Amino acid sequence: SYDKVSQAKSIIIGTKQTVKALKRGSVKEVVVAKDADPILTSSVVSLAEDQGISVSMVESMKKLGKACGIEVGAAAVAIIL
RNA sequence: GAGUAGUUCAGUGGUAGAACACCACCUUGCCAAGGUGGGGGUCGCGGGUUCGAAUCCCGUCUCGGGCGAAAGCCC
RNA sequence: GGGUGCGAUGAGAAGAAGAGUAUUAAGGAUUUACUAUGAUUAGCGACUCUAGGAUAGUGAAAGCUAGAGGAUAGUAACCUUAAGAAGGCACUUCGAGCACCC
């Protein structure tokens, strides 16, 4: 949901920073794009599903980053609430 | 008059030069640079003159160009 | 404020390598090669020998080709000492603008 990402209080942008955020489990929701490379997505959805956190899948990664406030797009973004 | 190496130019009778690129090793992270080493050329082509022709002579082709009614000529 | 190129398929900062390497020296060492030079005088042109070649003049010996052999320095290669760097991808965190043009 692009709506939940555009809103929310505490978010984090980028795959590396989202997995690093998963390494402390201070994240409430995880939003990942489907059109992104699976080599980069599987790595985060594995740990996400392992932690027991909810895993969402969205269409485009461009509109994702657009919803995050960034101006280039993001492969994976986590709401750290 | 122009024509020579991949290319840009030189070379005005003593066997073909420079850079830039291609290649090797330095240098296995991948490069790039760099430092060395190396390779490559019917001088447009065939004659001719000469010990010898990228040079000069004649023929020939292309192209630029200029004179011309043209065929042709000049650089 | 205007215009493009790129960026969570990771901008840009930093570190880490890179590396005590490439290199400048101060030497040491005296072979490999690399290139440079062969008195005068003929002579445009000459390290020496071999083999061919091919040769007009000058010449004791000539310009092509292939080997082989000599001393002079200058190199780069093994050491030692003192100095001795660096850009990009990729690593490693921070994580968003960097670059060129009026």
PDB file of N, CA and C (backbone and C1' of nucleotides) in Angstrom, chain B residues 14-15 26-27 29-38 51-52, chain C residues 21-23 34 44 54-56 63-65 76 87-90:
ATOM      1  P     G B  14      67.624  10.581 -50.780  1.00  0.00           P
ATOM      2  O5'   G B  14      68.084   9.064 -50.608  1.00  0.00           O
ATOM      3  C5'   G B  14      67.261   8.143 -49.886  1.00  0.00           C
ATOM      4  C4'   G B  14      68.065   7.019 -49.270  1.00  0.00           C
ATOM      5  C3'   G B  14      68.709   7.314 -47.917  1.00  0.00           C
ATOM      6  O3'   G B  14      68.892   6.072 -47.229  1.00  0.00           O
ATOM      7  C1'   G B  14      70.395   7.013 -49.534  1.00  0.00           C
ATOM      8  P     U B  15      67.828   5.584 -46.120  1.00  0.00           P
ATOM      9  O5'   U B  15      67.400   4.100 -46.550  1.00  0.00           O
ATOM     10  C5'   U B  15      66.496   3.858 -47.633  1.00  0.00           C
ATOM     11  C4'   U B  15      65.317   2.986 -47.244  1.00  0.00           C
ATOM     12  C3'   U B  15      65.608   1.898 -46.201  1.00  0.00           C
ATOM     13  O3'   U B  15      64.590   1.804 -45.159  1.00  0.00           O
ATOM     14  C1'   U B  15      64.845   0.892 -48.236  1.00  0.00           C
ATOM     15  P     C B  26      53.158  -9.658 -15.104  1.00  0.00           P
ATOM     16  O5'   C B  26      53.626  -8.201 -14.655  1.00  0.00           O
ATOM     17  C5'   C B  26      54.607  -8.019 -13.647  1.00  0.00           C
ATOM     18  C4'   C B  26      54.953  -6.560 -13.491  1.00  0.00           C
ATOM     19  C3'   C B  26      54.050  -5.728 -12.585  1.00  0.00           C
ATOM     20  O3'   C B  26      54.354  -5.885 -11.204  1.00  0.00           O
ATOM     21  C1'   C B  26      54.496  -4.545 -14.594  1.00  0.00           C
ATOM     22  P     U B  27      53.234  -6.264 -10.103  1.00  0.00           P
ATOM     23  O5'   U B  27      52.314  -7.338 -10.816  1.00  0.00           O
ATOM     24  C5'   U B  27      51.182  -7.878 -10.151  1.00  0.00           C
ATOM     25  C4'   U B  27      49.946  -7.688 -10.983  1.00  0.00           C
ATOM     26  C3'   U B  27      50.104  -8.069 -12.457  1.00  0.00           C
ATOM     27  O3'   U B  27      48.868  -8.583 -12.964  1.00  0.00           O
ATOM     28  C1'   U B  27      49.510  -5.791 -12.295  1.00  0.00           C
ATOM     29  P     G B  29      45.287  -7.824  -7.313  1.00  0.00           P
ATOM     30  O5'   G B  29      43.702  -7.854  -7.489  1.00  0.00           O
ATOM     31  C5'   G B  29      43.004  -9.087  -7.361  1.00  0.00           C
ATOM     32  C4'   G B  29      41.631  -9.024  -7.976  1.00  0.00           C
ATOM     33  C3'   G B  29      41.509  -8.234  -9.274  1.00  0.00           C
ATOM     34  O3'   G B  29      41.887  -8.986 -10.417  1.00  0.00           O
ATOM     35  C1'   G B  29      39.788  -7.592  -7.786  1.00  0.00           C
ATOM     36  P     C B  30      42.439  -8.255 -11.740  1.00  0.00           P
ATOM     37  O5'   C B  30      41.143  -7.589 -12.370  1.00  0.00           O
ATOM     38  C5'   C B  30      40.021  -8.372 -12.744  1.00  0.00           C
ATOM     39  C4'   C B  30      38.896  -7.476 -13.165  1.00  0.00           C
ATOM     40  C3'   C B  30      39.310  -6.368 -14.112  1.00  0.00           C
ATOM     41  O3'   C B  30      39.397  -6.799 -15.462  1.00  0.00           O
ATOM     42  C1'   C B  30      38.042  -5.446 -12.351  1.00  0.00           C
ATOM     43  P     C B  31      40.656  -6.355 -16.355  1.00  0.00           P
ATOM     44  O5'   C B  31      41.112  -4.992 -15.666  1.00  0.00           O
ATOM     45  C5'   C B  31      41.422  -3.846 -16.440  1.00  0.00           C
ATOM     46  C4'   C B  31      40.337  -2.794 -16.337  1.00  0.00           C
ATOM     47  C3'   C B  31      40.712  -1.410 -16.852  1.00  0.00           C
ATOM     48  O3'   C B  31      40.546  -1.290 -18.248  1.00  0.00           O
ATOM     49  C1'   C B  31      39.596  -1.244 -14.752  1.00  0.00           C
ATOM     50  P     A B  32      41.789  -0.918 -19.205  1.00  0.00           P
ATOM     51  O5'   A B  32      42.031   0.630 -18.949  1.00  0.00           O
ATOM     52  C5'   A B  32      41.014   1.577 -19.207  1.00  0.00           C
ATOM     53  C4'   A B  32      41.271   2.864 -18.472  1.00  0.00           C
ATOM     54  C3'   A B  32      42.706   3.379 -18.489  1.00  0.00           C
ATOM     55  O3'   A B  32      43.061   4.035 -19.700  1.00  0.00           O
ATOM     56  C1'   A B  32      41.880   3.464 -16.289  1.00  0.00           C
ATOM     57  P     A B  33      44.481   3.772 -20.420  1.00  0.00           P
ATOM     58  O5'   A B  33      45.426   4.908 -19.831  1.00  0.00           O
ATOM     59  C5'   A B  33      44.898   6.158 -19.417  1.00  0.00           C
ATOM     60  C4'   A B  33      45.625   6.681 -18.202  1.00  0.00           C
ATOM     61  C3'   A B  33      47.138   6.520 -18.207  1.00  0.00           C
ATOM     62  O3'   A B  33      47.818   7.465 -19.022  1.00  0.00           O
ATOM     63  C1'   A B  33      46.304   5.848 -16.116  1.00  0.00           C
ATOM     64  P     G B  34      48.926   6.975 -20.089  1.00  0.00           P
ATOM     65  O5'   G B  34      50.299   7.020 -19.295  1.00  0.00           O
ATOM     66  C5'   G B  34      50.506   7.890 -18.195  1.00  0.00           C
ATOM     67  C4'   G B  34      51.434   7.233 -17.208  1.00  0.00           C
ATOM     68  C3'   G B  34      52.526   6.378 -17.841  1.00  0.00           C
ATOM     69  O3'   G B  34      53.665   7.133 -18.212  1.00  0.00           O
ATOM     70  C1'   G B  34      51.403   5.121 -16.193  1.00  0.00           C
ATOM     71  P     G B  35      54.474   6.825 -19.570  1.00  0.00           P
ATOM     72  O5'   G B  35      55.935   6.492 -19.044  1.00  0.00           O
ATOM     73  C5'   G B  35      56.191   6.394 -17.653  1.00  0.00           C
ATOM     74  C4'   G B  35      56.864   5.089 -17.325  1.00  0.00           C
ATOM     75  C3'   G B  35      57.540   4.384 -18.492  1.00  0.00           C
ATOM     76  O3'   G B  35      58.767   4.960 -18.885  1.00  0.00           O
ATOM     77  C1'   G B  35      56.275   2.820 -17.296  1.00  0.00           C
ATOM     78  P     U B  36      59.181   5.003 -20.439  1.00  0.00           P
ATOM     79  O5'   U B  36      60.255   3.843 -20.562  1.00  0.00           O
ATOM     80  C5'   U B  36      60.144   2.871 -21.582  1.00  0.00           C
ATOM     81  C4'   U B  36      60.137   1.483 -21.009  1.00  0.00           C
ATOM     82  C3'   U B  36      60.299   0.373 -22.032  1.00  0.00           C
ATOM     83  O3'   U B  36      61.665   0.149 -22.342  1.00  0.00           O
ATOM     84  C1'   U B  36      58.482  -0.130 -20.593  1.00  0.00           C
ATOM     85  P     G B  37      62.249   0.520 -23.794  1.00  0.00           P
ATOM     86  O5'   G B  37      62.549  -0.898 -24.444  1.00  0.00           O
ATOM     87  C5'   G B  37      61.665  -1.417 -25.418  1.00  0.00           C
ATOM     88  C4'   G B  37      61.060  -2.738 -25.006  1.00  0.00           C
ATOM     89  C3'   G B  37      60.331  -3.439 -26.128  1.00  0.00           C
ATOM     90  O3'   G B  37      61.202  -4.098 -27.023  1.00  0.00           O
ATOM     91  C1'   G B  37      58.915  -3.380 -24.278  1.00  0.00           C
ATOM     92  P     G B  38      61.218  -3.639 -28.561  1.00  0.00           P
ATOM     93  O5'   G B  38      59.917  -4.350 -29.122  1.00  0.00           O
ATOM     94  C5'   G B  38      59.528  -5.618 -28.601  1.00  0.00           C
ATOM     95  C4'   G B  38      58.358  -6.180 -29.345  1.00  0.00           C
ATOM     96  C3'   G B  38      58.425  -5.918 -30.846  1.00  0.00           C
ATOM     97  O3'   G B  38      57.954  -7.038 -31.591  1.00  0.00           O
ATOM     98  C1'   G B  38      56.454  -4.961 -29.946  1.00  0.00           C
ATOM     99  P     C B  51      73.293   3.458 -62.395  1.00  0.00           P
ATOM    100  O5'   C B  51      72.563   2.366 -61.479  1.00  0.00           O
ATOM    101  C5'   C B  51      73.012   1.010 -61.460  1.00  0.00           C
ATOM    102  C4'   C B  51      72.981   0.398 -60.068  1.00  0.00           C
ATOM    103  C3'   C B  51      71.713   0.621 -59.252  1.00  0.00           C
ATOM    104  O3'   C B  51      70.677  -0.278 -59.582  1.00  0.00           O
ATOM    105  C1'   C B  51      73.579   1.147 -57.916  1.00  0.00           C
ATOM    106  P     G B  52      69.358   0.286 -60.295  1.00  0.00           P
ATOM    107  O5'   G B  52      68.490   0.795 -59.078  1.00  0.00           O
ATOM    108  C5'   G B  52      68.273  -0.064 -57.981  1.00  0.00           C
ATOM    109  C4'   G B  52      68.125   0.750 -56.744  1.00  0.00           C
ATOM    110  C3'   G B  52      66.916   1.653 -56.721  1.00  0.00           C
ATOM    111  O3'   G B  52      65.736   0.947 -56.390  1.00  0.00           O
ATOM    112  C1'   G B  52      68.829   2.818 -55.931  1.00  0.00           C
TER     113        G B  52
ATOM    114  P     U C  21      57.974  -1.408  -0.347  1.00  0.00           P
ATOM    115  O5'   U C  21      57.486  -1.591  -1.848  1.00  0.00           O
ATOM    116  C5'   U C  21      57.046  -2.852  -2.330  1.00  0.00           C
ATOM    117  C4'   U C  21      56.007  -2.668  -3.406  1.00  0.00           C
ATOM    118  C3'   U C  21      56.407  -1.735  -4.543  1.00  0.00           C
ATOM    119  O3'   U C  21      57.104  -2.432  -5.566  1.00  0.00           O
ATOM    120  C1'   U C  21      54.235  -1.162  -3.740  1.00  0.00           C
ATOM    121  P     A C  22      58.207  -1.689  -6.467  1.00  0.00           P
ATOM    122  O5'   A C  22      57.369  -0.611  -7.272  1.00  0.00           O
ATOM    123  C5'   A C  22      56.780  -0.945  -8.516  1.00  0.00           C
ATOM    124  C4'   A C  22      56.198   0.274  -9.180  1.00  0.00           C
ATOM    125  C3'   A C  22      57.171   1.402  -9.488  1.00  0.00           C
ATOM    126  O3'   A C  22      57.946   1.188 -10.654  1.00  0.00           O
ATOM    127  C1'   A C  22      55.252   2.298  -8.467  1.00  0.00           C
ATOM    128  P     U C  23      59.505   1.576 -10.666  1.00  0.00           P
ATOM    129  O5'   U C  23      59.559   3.059 -10.066  1.00  0.00           O
ATOM    130  C5'   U C  23      59.114   4.179 -10.828  1.00  0.00           C
ATOM    131  C4'   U C  23      59.036   5.450 -10.011  1.00  0.00           C
ATOM    132  C3'   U C  23      60.357   6.090  -9.625  1.00  0.00           C
ATOM    133  O3'   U C  23      60.953   6.836 -10.671  1.00  0.00           O
ATOM    134  C1'   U C  23      58.943   6.032  -7.736  1.00  0.00           C
ATOM    135  P     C C  34      69.623  -5.496 -27.506  1.00  0.00           P
ATOM    136  O5'   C C  34      68.862  -4.112 -27.658  1.00  0.00           O
ATOM    137  C5'   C C  34      67.466  -4.051 -27.398  1.00  0.00           C
ATOM    138  C4'   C C  34      67.076  -2.912 -26.478  1.00  0.00           C
ATOM    139  C3'   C C  34      67.736  -1.560 -26.730  1.00  0.00           C
ATOM    140  O3'   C C  34      67.234  -0.862 -27.859  1.00  0.00           O
ATOM    141  C1'   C C  34      67.821  -2.022 -24.433  1.00  0.00           C
ATOM    142  P     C C  44      80.180  13.268 -51.194  1.00  0.00           P
ATOM    143  O5'   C C  44      79.584  13.307 -49.707  1.00  0.00           O
ATOM    144  C5'   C C  44      78.749  14.377 -49.264  1.00  0.00           C
ATOM    145  C4'   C C  44      77.570  13.859 -48.483  1.00  0.00           C
ATOM    146  C3'   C C  44      77.872  12.726 -47.516  1.00  0.00           C
ATOM    147  O3'   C C  44      78.225  13.227 -46.241  1.00  0.00           O
ATOM    148  C1'   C C  44      75.914  12.227 -48.806  1.00  0.00           C
ATOM    149  P     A C  54      72.559  -9.790 -56.933  1.00  0.00           P
ATOM    150  O5'   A C  54      71.768  -8.434 -57.209  1.00  0.00           O
ATOM    151  C5'   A C  54      71.502  -7.511 -56.158  1.00  0.00           C
ATOM    152  C4'   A C  54      72.380  -6.294 -56.283  1.00  0.00           C
ATOM    153  C3'   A C  54      73.128  -6.171 -57.619  1.00  0.00           C
ATOM    154  O3'   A C  54      73.091  -4.823 -58.093  1.00  0.00           O
ATOM    155  C1'   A C  54      74.687  -6.200 -55.802  1.00  0.00           C
ATOM    156  P     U C  55      73.319  -4.485 -59.652  1.00  0.00           P
ATOM    157  O5'   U C  55      74.365  -3.294 -59.547  1.00  0.00           O
ATOM    158  C5'   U C  55      74.857  -2.958 -58.261  1.00  0.00           C
ATOM    159  C4'   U C  55      76.118  -2.147 -58.299  1.00  0.00           C
ATOM    160  C3'   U C  55      77.119  -2.503 -59.383  1.00  0.00           C
ATOM    161  O3'   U C  55      76.768  -1.912 -60.631  1.00  0.00           O
ATOM    162  C1'   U C  55      78.222  -2.336 -57.293  1.00  0.00           C
ATOM    163  P     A C  56      77.838  -1.584 -61.791  1.00  0.00           P
ATOM    164  O5'   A C  56      78.512  -0.207 -61.330  1.00  0.00           O
ATOM    165  C5'   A C  56      79.428   0.497 -62.167  1.00  0.00           C
ATOM    166  C4'   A C  56      79.363   2.012 -62.009  1.00  0.00           C
ATOM    167  C3'   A C  56      80.431   2.662 -61.134  1.00  0.00           C
ATOM    168  O3'   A C  56      81.676   2.794 -61.795  1.00  0.00           O
ATOM    169  C1'   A C  56      78.306   3.687 -60.744  1.00  0.00           C
ATOM    170  P     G C  63      76.805  -2.262 -48.255  1.00  0.00           P
ATOM    171  O5'   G C  63      75.580  -1.336 -47.816  1.00  0.00           O
ATOM    172  C5'   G C  63      75.626  -0.597 -46.594  1.00  0.00           C
ATOM    173  C4'   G C  63      74.444   0.338 -46.393  1.00  0.00           C
ATOM    174  C3'   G C  63      73.089  -0.168 -46.886  1.00  0.00           C
ATOM    175  O3'   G C  63      72.076   0.242 -45.971  1.00  0.00           O
ATOM    176  C1'   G C  63      73.600   1.905 -47.951  1.00  0.00           C
ATOM    177  P     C C  64      71.326  -0.846 -45.064  1.00  0.00           P
ATOM    178  O5'   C C  64      70.706  -1.864 -46.112  1.00  0.00           O
ATOM    179  C5'   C C  64      69.696  -1.465 -47.025  1.00  0.00           C
ATOM    180  C4'   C C  64      68.997  -2.676 -47.582  1.00  0.00           C
ATOM    181  C3'   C C  64      68.834  -3.811 -46.585  1.00  0.00           C
ATOM    182  O3'   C C  64      67.728  -3.664 -45.725  1.00  0.00           O
ATOM    183  C1'   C C  64      69.783  -4.675 -48.539  1.00  0.00           C
ATOM    184  P     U C  65      67.931  -4.062 -44.190  1.00  0.00           P
ATOM    185  O5'   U C  65      67.879  -5.649 -44.202  1.00  0.00           O
ATOM    186  C5'   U C  65      66.896  -6.345 -44.952  1.00  0.00           C
ATOM    187  C4'   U C  65      67.298  -7.778 -45.207  1.00  0.00           C
ATOM    188  C3'   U C  65      67.765  -8.582 -44.001  1.00  0.00           C
ATOM    189  O3'   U C  65      66.708  -8.983 -43.140  1.00  0.00           O
ATOM    190  C1'   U C  65      69.181  -9.021 -45.843  1.00  0.00           C
ATOM    191  P     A C  76      66.950   3.931 -14.732  1.00  0.00           P
ATOM    192  O5'   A C  76      65.456   3.424 -14.485  1.00  0.00           O
ATOM    193  C5'   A C  76      65.209   2.121 -13.983  1.00  0.00           C
ATOM    194  C4'   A C  76      64.943   1.130 -15.086  1.00  0.00           C
ATOM    195  C3'   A C  76      64.959  -0.333 -14.664  1.00  0.00           C
ATOM    196  O3'   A C  76      63.755  -0.769 -14.048  1.00  0.00           O
ATOM    197  C1'   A C  76      66.249  -0.071 -16.631  1.00  0.00           C
ATOM    198  P     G C  87      43.013   9.532  -4.244  1.00  0.00           P
ATOM    199  O5'   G C  87      41.915   9.287  -5.372  1.00  0.00           O
ATOM    200  C5'   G C  87      41.962  10.028  -6.581  1.00  0.00           C
ATOM    201  C4'   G C  87      41.498   9.237  -7.787  1.00  0.00           C
ATOM    202  C3'   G C  87      40.306   8.312  -7.624  1.00  0.00           C
ATOM    203  O3'   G C  87      39.070   9.000  -7.521  1.00  0.00           O
ATOM    204  C1'   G C  87      41.929   7.337  -9.080  1.00  0.00           C
ATOM    205  P     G C  88      37.846   8.330  -6.725  1.00  0.00           P
ATOM    206  O5'   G C  88      37.437   7.045  -7.586  1.00  0.00           O
ATOM    207  C5'   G C  88      36.633   7.168  -8.750  1.00  0.00           C
ATOM    208  C4'   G C  88      36.357   5.848  -9.452  1.00  0.00           C
ATOM    209  C3'   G C  88      35.695   4.729  -8.667  1.00  0.00           C
ATOM    210  O3'   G C  88      34.320   4.972  -8.411  1.00  0.00           O
ATOM    211  C1'   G C  88      37.327   3.842 -10.160  1.00  0.00           C
ATOM    212  P     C C  89      33.565   4.247  -7.187  1.00  0.00           P
ATOM    213  O5'   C C  89      33.279   2.781  -7.733  1.00  0.00           O
ATOM    214  C5'   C C  89      32.594   2.595  -8.958  1.00  0.00           C
ATOM    215  C4'   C C  89      32.679   1.166  -9.412  1.00  0.00           C
ATOM    216  C3'   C C  89      32.450   0.120  -8.337  1.00  0.00           C
ATOM    217  O3'   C C  89      31.089  -0.039  -7.982  1.00  0.00           O
ATOM    218  C1'   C C  89      34.319  -0.494  -9.629  1.00  0.00           C
ATOM    219  P     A C  90      30.643   0.074  -6.439  1.00  0.00           P
ATOM    220  O5'   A C  90      30.879  -1.397  -5.876  1.00  0.00           O
ATOM    221  C5'   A C  90      30.668  -2.536  -6.696  1.00  0.00           C
ATOM    222  C4'   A C  90      31.641  -3.637  -6.357  1.00  0.00           C
ATOM    223  C3'   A C  90      31.965  -3.793  -4.883  1.00  0.00           C
ATOM    224  O3'   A C  90      30.942  -4.362  -4.088  1.00  0.00           O
ATOM    225  C1'   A C  90      33.973  -3.804  -6.064  1.00  0.00           C
TER     226        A C  90
END
